[PDB]
């Protein structure tokens, strides 16, 4: 048997205690942005950290369940808030849960068919994500987006589809949040 | 197959509410034989039969690979001396975990195994406790305020209440000048 545990959760950093962190800057995320120069400017200019994660996963078995705490740090990339490079599970069946902490923004969800859909998150939002949808969260305020995000543990990983193929829309700024289709 | 639409609900920091979730209630009458002290129980069931605990749900189908989640608000009080709880169970489909999140409040979590080793986790604003597979858990409030918490729980995962109906946890948790843990008398 796994031995029960306690972690303590920080609301104002997103930090979890013993959760094994990860960093993402702009340049770990080539080829994300539509806005290719205005990347390429940014990284130049010390690529700054788009979102940082704090994790607590088990081992990949059926039933099982990982947790983690997501900071997107506001910015835009070009017109193109900061955003997760997101993802499909290996095993699409799996759905998640989301639950805004801090800040302000949205999520991104795609279908294989082709249904794209963005929901808005504040504090207190609890997003449901079905099996089978791809998704992205967005932060589109100028402060720190901070979520708490709850998966299968055998959900695992699939980035190449939206490494090539991608979501079917963009998330910029235009005076105002503005979801428009992608090339 | 249609592809189920994905959404945003709001939850309440402050109430636990979470909208457009189905509630359930349960009250002292609602949990027979399950405190020790059966004369403070009967006792407070006429003077009152308040509500010991109440819980926001939004349940998908049994099926593998999908997430339900929910919040209760677990109300202060003690039956005699023990701190009121939730019913506790194990999953039906046993290696199922779960996952909880504590948001207002104070209390703790009881678990056991199917042996009944036992552990009690402390639980405040901020904590997440993990509940791994095989274990059986029971929320405590141990405060004087409502302690308020959200649970994220496989959708497969499925309720045993039977097993704790009739043997109950091999702890009981009470006040006695302090918060103390000890056996269950009839365990
Ligand atoms: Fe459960």
Same mark, same amino acid.
């Given at each position: 048997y796994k031995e029960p545990f306690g972690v303590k959760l920080d609301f104002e950093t997103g930090i979890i205690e013993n959760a094994k962190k990860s960093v993402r800057r702009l340049? +770990?995320?080539?080829?994300?942005?539509?806005?290719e120069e205005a990347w390429k400017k940014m990284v130049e200019e010390? +690529?700054?950290?788009v979102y940082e994660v704090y994790a607590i996963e088990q081992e990949e078995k059926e039933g099982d369940l990982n947790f983690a705490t997501t900071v997107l740090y506001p910015g835009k990339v070009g017109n193109e808030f900061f955003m997760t490079k997101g993802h499909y599970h290996s095993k699409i069946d799996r759905a998640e849960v989301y639950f805004a902490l801090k800040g302000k923004g949205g999520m991104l969800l795609q279908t294989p068919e082709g249904e794209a859909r963005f929901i808005e998150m504040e504090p207190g939002t609890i997003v449901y994500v079905p099996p089978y949808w791809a998704h992205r969260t967005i932060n589109t305020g100028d402060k720190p987006f901070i979520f708490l995000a709850l998966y299968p543990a055998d959900a695992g990983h699939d980035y190449g589809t939206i490494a090539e193929k991608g979501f079917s829309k963009i998330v910029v700024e235009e005076n105002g949040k503005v979801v428009v289709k992608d090339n």
């Open positions: 340049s +770990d995320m080539k080829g994300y942005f539509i806005d010390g +690529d700054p950290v």
